[PDB]
Amino acid sequence: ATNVKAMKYLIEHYFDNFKVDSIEIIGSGYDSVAYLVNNEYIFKTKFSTNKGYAKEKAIYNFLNTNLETNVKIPNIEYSYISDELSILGYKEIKGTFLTPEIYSTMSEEEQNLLKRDIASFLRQMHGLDYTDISECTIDNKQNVLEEYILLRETIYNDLTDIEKDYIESFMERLNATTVFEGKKCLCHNDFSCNHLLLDGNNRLTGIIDFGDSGIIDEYCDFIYLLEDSEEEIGTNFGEDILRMYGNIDIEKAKEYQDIVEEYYPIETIVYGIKNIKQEFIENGRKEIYKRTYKD
Numbered sequence: 001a002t003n004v005k006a007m008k009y010l011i012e013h014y015f016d017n018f019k020v021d022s023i024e025i026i027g028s029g030y031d032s033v034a035y036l037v038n039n040e041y042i043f044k045t046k047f048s049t050n051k052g053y054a055k056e057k058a059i060y061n062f063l064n065t066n067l068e069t070n071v072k073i074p075n076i077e078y079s080y081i082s083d084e085l086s087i088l089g090y091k092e093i094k095g096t097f098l099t100p101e102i103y104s105t106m107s108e109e110e111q112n113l114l115k116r117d118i119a120s121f122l123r124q125m126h127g128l129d130y131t132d133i134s135e136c137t138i139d140n141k142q143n144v145l146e147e148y149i150l151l152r153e154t155i156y157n158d159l160t161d162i163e164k165d166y167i168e169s170f171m172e173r174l175n176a177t178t179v180f181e182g183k184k185c186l187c188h189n190d191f192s193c194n195h196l197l198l199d200g201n202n203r204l205t206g207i208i209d210f211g212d213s214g215i216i217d218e219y220c221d222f223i224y225l226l227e228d229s230e231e232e233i234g235t236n237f238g239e240d241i242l243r244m245y246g247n248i249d250i251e252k253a254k255e256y257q258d259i260v261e262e263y264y265p266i267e268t269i270v271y272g273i274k275n276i277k278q279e280f281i282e283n284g285r286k287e288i289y290k291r292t293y294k295d
């Protein structure tokens with residue numbers, strides 16, 4: 001139980017008179033680990049990476065001050081932020097994560113109420129005056145262009161023709177699309193069903209992981225709601241939510257999701273380059289072949 005011991009130590013060291021009586025791992029990413037401490041607190045942690053926890057903390061603070069909602073989000077009680085180590089702690093939001101299986105046991109009315117809850121939460125968050133967090137802007141198109149330049153400066157010339165063509169074909173679509181020219185607002189920006197918590201009546205009770213959140217295209221928060229995969233509910237779910245949300249071009253939302261999805265293998269390669277992780281470069285290149293050959 002080595003990781004747990006270390007992180008217990010660090011929590012007690014940086015947070016005076018916080019006492020860890022229990023601690024377990026409840027989640028992880030490639031760069032992070034989350035712990036449930038005293039069956040009450042979530043502690044999210046990471047070591048040296050590529051101002052992440054600073055922003056996420058600022059966003060929680062901004063949202064807890066400004067949202068009027070019964071939906072719970074993390075409320076940061078402990079933080080330690082440095083280049084080499086960042087920790088955020090908050091009381092665990094209780095509930096059951098939404099999944100496709102759970103959704104399929106819900107009555108039609110239950111499903112509608114959950115969809116309305118989501119639409120309402122997104123309408124309220126996207127309608128906030130974000131002046132107070134105006135530094136948290138994210139420009140996805142410009143980010144992609146910069147990543148493309150990094151590719152050109154590093155490994156692009158060693159890729160295969162098939163890989164190059166996939167990339168260039170994406171860049172050509174990026175240049176022709178209009179889906180980055182619409183409304184910008186504060187978005188969750190990783191808005192998948194594994195971040196949505198339900199209460200005992202299958203209503204939306206909490207939303208977690210605003211770690212990628214920022215001021216960005218309004219379309220961003222529909223990308224997973226529109227996704228047809230084993231992990232998400234399905235395209236009709238996102239469509240209905242978009243109709244409830246109102247005043248948004250559904251076809252552009254879908255175009256934006258389709259473009260993000262096409263980018264994925266390239267995003268994966270770029271992550272590998274930036275983090276010096278060859279396995280990610282390989283995985284993304286292989287995925288380009290998988291997509292190219294899908295019939």
Ligand SMILES: Nc1nc2c(ncn2[C@@H]2O[C@H](COP(=O)(O)OP(=O)(O)CP(=O)(O)O)[C@@H](O)[C@H]2O)c(=O)[nH]1
Pocket residue numbers: 026027028029030032033034042044074091092093094095190194208209210211
């Ligand atoms: N019940 C519950 N689970 C939570 C809460 N906060 C985090 N979790 C659990 O911890 C996991 C990791 O938290 P999360 O913020 O998503 O992770 P992360 O550090 O951003 C890494 P990634 O972005 O890949 O999710 C979640 O998937 C979930 O299982 C919370 O308040 N309530």
Ligand SMILES: [Cl-]
Pocket residue numbers: 278281282285
């Ligand atoms: Cl490789």
Ligand SMILES: [Mg+2]
Pocket residue numbers: 195209
């Ligand atoms: Mg997460």
Ligand SMILES: [Mg+2]
Pocket residue numbers: 190209210211212
């Ligand atoms: Mg996250």
